[PDB]
Each structure stands twice: as structure tokens, then as C-alpha cells.
Coordinates of all heavy atoms in Angstrom, one line a residue:
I379 N -10.6 -17.4 -72.2 CA -11.3 -18.1 -73.3 C -10.7 -19.4 -73.8 O -11.4 -20.4 -74.1 CB -11.4 -17.0 -74.4 CG1 -12.4 -15.8 -74.1 CG2 -11.8 -17.6 -75.7 CD1 -12.2 -14.7 -75.0
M380 N -9.3 -19.4 -73.8 CA -8.6 -20.6 -74.2 C -9.0 -21.7 -73.3 O -9.0 -22.9 -73.7 CB -7.1 -20.3 -74.3 CG -6.7 -19.3 -75.3 SD -7.6 -19.5 -76.9 CE -6.9 -21.1 -77.4
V381 N -9.0 -21.4 -72.0 CA -9.3 -22.5 -71.0 C -10.7 -22.9 -71.1 O -11.0 -24.1 -71.2 CB -8.9 -22.0 -69.6 CG1 -9.4 -22.9 -68.5 CG2 -7.4 -21.9 -69.5
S382 N -11.6 -22.0 -71.0 CA -13.1 -22.3 -70.9 C -13.7 -22.8 -72.1 O -14.8 -23.5 -72.0 CB -13.8 -21.1 -70.3 OG -13.8 -20.0 -71.2
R383 N -13.2 -22.6 -73.3 CA -13.8 -23.0 -74.6 C -13.0 -24.1 -75.2 O -13.4 -24.6 -76.3 CB -13.9 -21.8 -75.5 CG -14.6 -20.6 -74.8 CD -15.9 -20.9 -74.3 NE -17.0 -21.2 -75.2 CZ -18.2 -21.3 -74.9 NH1 -18.6 -21.1 -73.6 NH2 -19.1 -21.6 -75.8
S384 N -11.9 -24.7 -74.6 CA -11.1 -25.6 -75.2 C -11.8 -27.0 -75.5 O -11.5 -27.7 -76.5 CB -9.8 -25.8 -74.4 OG -10.2 -26.2 -73.1
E385 N -12.8 -27.3 -74.6 CA -13.6 -28.4 -74.7 C -15.0 -28.2 -75.2 O -15.8 -29.1 -75.3 CB -13.5 -29.3 -73.4 CG -12.1 -29.8 -73.1 CD -12.0 -30.7 -71.9 OE1 -12.8 -31.8 -71.9 OE2 -11.4 -30.3 -70.9
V386 N -15.3 -26.9 -75.5 CA -16.7 -26.6 -75.9 C -16.6 -26.4 -77.4 O -17.1 -27.2 -78.2 CB -17.2 -25.3 -75.3 CG1 -18.5 -24.9 -75.7 CG2 -17.2 -25.6 -73.7
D387 N -16.2 -25.2 -77.9 CA -16.4 -24.8 -79.3 C -15.2 -24.2 -79.9 O -15.3 -23.4 -80.9 CB -17.6 -23.9 -79.5 CG -17.4 -22.7 -78.5 OD1 -16.5 -22.6 -77.8 OD2 -18.5 -22.0 -78.4
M388 N -13.9 -24.6 -79.4 CA -12.7 -24.0 -79.9 C -12.5 -24.1 -81.4 O -12.1 -23.2 -82.1 CB -11.5 -24.5 -79.2 CG -10.1 -23.9 -79.5 SD -10.2 -22.1 -79.2 CE -10.4 -22.1 -77.4
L389 N -12.9 -25.3 -81.9 CA -12.8 -25.6 -83.3 C -13.7 -24.6 -84.2 O -13.3 -24.1 -85.2 CB -13.2 -27.0 -83.7 CG -12.2 -28.0 -83.2 CD1 -12.7 -29.4 -83.7 CD2 -10.8 -27.8 -83.6
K390 N -14.9 -24.3 -83.7 CA -15.8 -23.3 -84.4 C -15.2 -22.0 -84.2 O -15.2 -21.1 -85.2 CB -17.2 -23.4 -83.8 CG -18.0 -24.6 -84.2 CD -19.3 -24.6 -83.5 CE -20.3 -25.7 -84.1 NZ -21.6 -25.7 -83.4
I391 N -14.7 -21.6 -83.1 CA -14.0 -20.3 -82.9 C -12.9 -20.1 -83.9 O -12.8 -19.1 -84.5 CB -13.6 -20.2 -81.4 CG1 -14.7 -20.3 -80.4 CG2 -12.8 -18.8 -81.2 CD1 -14.3 -20.3 -79.0
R392 N -12.1 -21.1 -83.9 CA -10.9 -21.1 -84.9 C -11.4 -20.9 -86.3 O -10.7 -20.3 -87.1 CB -10.0 -22.3 -84.8 CG -9.3 -22.4 -83.4 CD -8.7 -23.7 -83.2 NE -8.0 -24.2 -84.5 CZ -7.5 -25.4 -84.7 NH1 -7.6 -26.3 -83.6 NH2 -7.0 -25.8 -85.8
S393 N -12.6 -21.5 -86.7 CA -13.1 -21.3 -88.0 C -13.5 -19.8 -88.3 O -13.3 -19.4 -89.3 CB -14.2 -22.3 -88.2 OG -14.8 -22.1 -89.5
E394 N -14.3 -19.4 -87.3 CA -14.7 -18.0 -87.5 C -13.6 -17.0 -87.4 O -13.6 -16.0 -88.2 CB -15.7 -17.7 -86.3 CG -17.0 -18.5 -86.3 CD -18.0 -18.1 -87.4 OE1 -17.7 -17.0 -88.1 OE2 -19.0 -18.7 -87.5
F395 N -12.6 -17.3 -86.6 CA -11.4 -16.4 -86.6 C -10.7 -16.3 -87.9 O -10.3 -15.3 -88.4 CB -10.4 -16.9 -85.4 CG -9.4 -15.9 -85.1 CD1 -9.5 -15.0 -84.0 CD2 -8.3 -15.7 -85.9 CE1 -8.5 -14.2 -83.7 CE2 -7.3 -14.8 -85.6 CZ -7.4 -14.0 -84.5
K396 N -10.4 -17.5 -88.4 CA -9.7 -17.6 -89.7 C -10.5 -17.0 -90.8 O -10.0 -16.3 -91.7 CB -9.4 -19.0 -90.0 CG -8.8 -19.3 -91.5 CD -7.4 -18.7 -91.5 CE -6.8 -18.9 -92.9 NZ -6.6 -20.4 -93.3
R397 N -11.8 -17.2 -90.9 CA -12.7 -16.7 -91.9 C -12.7 -15.1 -91.9 O -12.6 -14.5 -93.0 CB -14.1 -17.2 -91.8 CG -15.0 -16.8 -92.9 CD -16.3 -17.4 -92.9 NE -17.1 -17.0 -91.8 CZ -17.9 -16.0 -91.7 NH1 -18.1 -15.2 -92.7 NH2 -18.6 -15.7 -90.5
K398 N -12.8 -14.6 -90.7 CA -12.9 -13.1 -90.6 C -11.6 -12.4 -90.7 O -11.5 -11.4 -91.3 CB -13.6 -12.8 -89.3 CG -13.7 -11.2 -88.9 CD -14.5 -11.0 -87.7 CE -14.8 -9.5 -87.5 NZ -15.9 -9.4 -86.5
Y399 N -10.5 -12.9 -90.1 CA -9.3 -12.2 -90.0 C -8.2 -12.7 -90.9 O -7.1 -12.2 -91.0 CB -8.8 -12.3 -88.6 CG -9.7 -11.7 -87.5 CD1 -10.4 -12.4 -86.6 CD2 -10.0 -10.3 -87.6 CE1 -11.3 -11.8 -85.8 CE2 -10.9 -9.7 -86.8 CZ -11.5 -10.5 -85.9 OH -12.4 -9.9 -84.9
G400 N -8.5 -13.7 -91.7 CA -7.6 -14.2 -92.8 C -6.4 -15.0 -92.3 O -5.8 -15.7 -93.1
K401 N -6.0 -14.8 -91.1 CA -4.9 -15.7 -90.5 C -5.5 -16.5 -89.3 O -6.6 -16.2 -88.9 CB -3.7 -14.9 -90.0 CG -2.9 -14.2 -91.1 CD -2.0 -15.1 -91.8 CE -1.0 -14.4 -92.7 NZ -1.7 -13.7 -93.9
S402 N -4.8 -17.5 -88.8 CA -5.3 -18.4 -87.8 C -5.3 -17.8 -86.4 O -4.4 -16.9 -86.1 CB -4.5 -19.7 -87.9 OG -3.2 -19.4 -87.5
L403 N -6.1 -18.2 -85.6 CA -5.9 -17.9 -84.1 C -4.6 -18.3 -83.6 O -3.9 -17.6 -82.9 CB -7.0 -18.6 -83.3 CG -6.9 -18.6 -81.8 CD1 -7.0 -17.2 -81.3 CD2 -8.0 -19.4 -81.2
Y404 N -4.1 -19.5 -84.0 CA -2.7 -20.0 -83.6 C -1.7 -18.8 -84.0 O -0.8 -18.6 -83.2 CB -2.5 -21.2 -84.4 CG -1.3 -22.0 -84.0 CD1 -1.3 -23.0 -83.1 CD2 0.0 -21.6 -84.6 CE1 0.0 -23.7 -82.9 CE2 1.2 -22.3 -84.4 CZ 1.2 -23.3 -83.4 OH 2.3 -24.0 -83.1
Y405 N -1.8 -18.3 -85.2 CA -0.9 -17.3 -85.7 C -0.9 -16.0 -84.7 O 0.2 -15.5 -84.3 CB -1.2 -16.9 -87.1 CG -0.6 -15.6 -87.6 CD1 0.6 -15.7 -88.3 CD2 -1.2 -14.3 -87.6 CE1 1.2 -14.5 -88.9 CE2 -0.6 -13.2 -88.1 CZ 0.6 -13.3 -88.7 OH 1.2 -12.2 -89.2
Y406 N -2.0 -15.6 -84.4 CA -2.1 -14.4 -83.5 C -1.5 -14.7 -82.1 O -0.8 -13.9 -81.6 CB -3.6 -13.8 -83.4 CG -3.9 -12.9 -84.5 CD1 -4.2 -13.4 -85.9 CD2 -3.8 -11.5 -84.3 CE1 -4.5 -12.6 -86.9 CE2 -4.1 -10.7 -85.4 CZ -4.5 -11.2 -86.6 OH -4.8 -10.3 -87.7
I407 N -1.9 -15.9 -81.6 CA -1.4 -16.3 -80.3 C 0.1 -16.4 -80.3 O 0.8 -15.9 -79.4 CB -2.0 -17.6 -79.8 CG1 -3.5 -17.4 -79.5 CG2 -1.3 -18.2 -78.7 CD1 -4.2 -18.7 -79.2
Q408 N 0.7 -16.9 -81.4 CA 2.1 -17.1 -81.6 C 2.8 -15.7 -81.6 O 3.9 -15.6 -81.0 CB 2.4 -17.9 -82.8 CG 3.8 -18.5 -82.8 CD 4.0 -19.3 -84.1 OE1 3.5 -18.9 -85.2 NE2 4.6 -20.4 -84.1
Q409 N 2.2 -14.7 -82.2 CA 2.8 -13.4 -82.2 C 2.8 -12.7 -80.8 O 3.8 -12.0 -80.4 CB 2.2 -12.5 -83.3 CG 2.2 -13.1 -84.7 CD 3.6 -13.6 -85.1 OE1 4.5 -13.0 -84.8 NE2 3.6 -14.8 -85.8
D410 N 1.7 -12.9 -80.1 CA 1.5 -12.0 -79.0 C 2.0 -12.7 -77.7 O 2.2 -11.9 -76.7 CB 0.0 -11.9 -78.8 CG -0.5 -10.4 -79.0 OD1 -0.1 -9.8 -80.0 OD2 -1.1 -9.9 -78.1
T411 N 2.2 -13.9 -77.6 CA 2.7 -14.6 -76.4 C 4.0 -15.3 -76.7 O 4.2 -15.8 -77.8 CB 1.7 -15.5 -75.9 OG1 1.4 -16.6 -76.8 CG2 0.4 -14.8 -75.5
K412 N 4.9 -15.5 -75.7 CA 6.1 -16.2 -75.7 C 6.3 -17.1 -74.6 O 5.5 -17.2 -73.6 CB 7.3 -15.2 -75.8 CG 7.2 -14.2 -76.9 CD 7.3 -14.9 -78.3 CE 6.8 -14.0 -79.5 NZ 6.7 -14.7 -80.7
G413 N 7.3 -18.0 -74.6 CA 7.6 -18.9 -73.5 C 6.7 -20.1 -73.4 O 5.9 -20.3 -74.3
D414 N 6.9 -20.9 -72.4 CA 6.0 -21.9 -72.1 C 4.5 -21.5 -72.0 O 3.6 -22.3 -72.3 CB 6.3 -22.6 -70.8 CG 7.8 -23.1 -70.8 OD1 8.3 -23.7 -71.9 OD2 8.5 -23.0 -69.8
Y415 N 4.3 -20.2 -71.5 CA 3.0 -19.6 -71.6 C 2.4 -19.8 -73.1 O 1.3 -20.3 -73.2 CB 3.1 -18.2 -71.3 CG 1.8 -17.3 -71.4 CD1 0.6 -17.9 -71.1 CD2 1.9 -16.0 -71.9 CE1 -0.6 -17.1 -71.2 CE2 0.7 -15.2 -72.0 CZ -0.5 -15.8 -71.7 OH -1.7 -15.1 -71.8
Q416 N 3.2 -19.4 -74.1 CA 2.7 -19.5 -75.5 C 2.4 -21.0 -75.8 O 1.4 -21.3 -76.4 CB 3.8 -18.9 -76.4 CG 3.4 -19.0 -77.9 CD 4.5 -19.1 -78.9 OE1 5.3 -20.2 -78.9 NE2 4.8 -18.1 -79.6
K417 N 3.4 -21.8 -75.5 CA 3.2 -23.3 -75.8 C 1.9 -23.8 -75.2 O 1.1 -24.6 -75.9 CB 4.4 -24.1 -75.4 CG 5.5 -24.3 -76.4 CD 6.3 -23.0 -76.5 CE 7.5 -23.3 -77.5 NZ 8.5 -22.1 -77.6
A418 N 1.6 -23.4 -73.9 CA 0.4 -23.9 -73.3 C -0.9 -23.4 -74.1 O -1.8 -24.2 -74.4 CB 0.3 -23.4 -71.8
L419 N -0.8 -22.1 -74.5 CA -2.0 -21.6 -75.2 C -2.1 -22.2 -76.7 O -3.2 -22.5 -77.1 CB -1.9 -20.1 -75.3 CG -2.1 -19.3 -74.1 CD1 -1.9 -17.8 -74.4 CD2 -3.4 -19.6 -73.4
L420 N -1.0 -22.4 -77.3 CA -1.0 -23.1 -78.6 C -1.6 -24.4 -78.5 O -2.3 -24.9 -79.4 CB 0.4 -23.1 -79.3 CG 1.0 -21.7 -79.6 CD1 2.4 -21.8 -80.2 CD2 0.0 -21.0 -80.5
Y421 N -1.2 -25.2 -77.5 CA -1.8 -26.6 -77.3 C -3.3 -26.5 -77.1 O -4.1 -27.2 -77.7 CB -1.1 -27.2 -76.1 CG 0.2 -27.9 -76.3 CD1 1.2 -27.6 -75.5 CD2 0.4 -28.7 -77.4 CE1 2.5 -28.1 -75.7 CE2 1.7 -29.3 -77.6 CZ 2.7 -29.0 -76.7 OH 3.9 -29.6 -76.9

């Protein structure tokens, strides 16, 4: 999802995520992944 939607609708996804779950998509990614893997997803 991070790869295939990064140039499509990621900003809309991040808006729906924040509205429904109260924290950001970035926040959940940061908790669940670590390392350069995490940095790549956060970018």
C-alpha cells in the first residue's frame, strides 16, 4: 500500500486515517516498524 499509493492518494489516505483513528498513519508506522525499513516507509 505504501508503495502503490504513494503517488496516487496517500494524502487522502492519511486524512482518512487521522480522522478515524485519531493519530496519524506516520505514528502507527513508527510504532510498528524499525530500522531503515521504518525510515523508508515514513518517507
Side-chain angles (χ1 to χ4, degrees):
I379 292 170
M380 297 314 295
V381 167
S382 60
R383 310 307 289 190
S384 54
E385 297 187 56
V386 178
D387 48 8
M388 184 58 61
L389 293 184
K390 288 176 168 177
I391 298 173
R392 290 168 44 188
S393 176
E394 298 283 358
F395 194 101
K396 173 68 182 295
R397 182 176 67 88
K398 174 177 195 165
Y399 300 112
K401 294 280 191 296
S402 63
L403 170 64
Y404 187 99
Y405 167 91
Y406 274 81
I407 292 176
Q408 198 180 37
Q409 303 310 321
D410 247 52
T411 61
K412 303 296 163 186
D414 301 321
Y415 176 38
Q416 178 208 74
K417 268 77 174 187
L419 293 182
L420 292 181
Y421 282 130

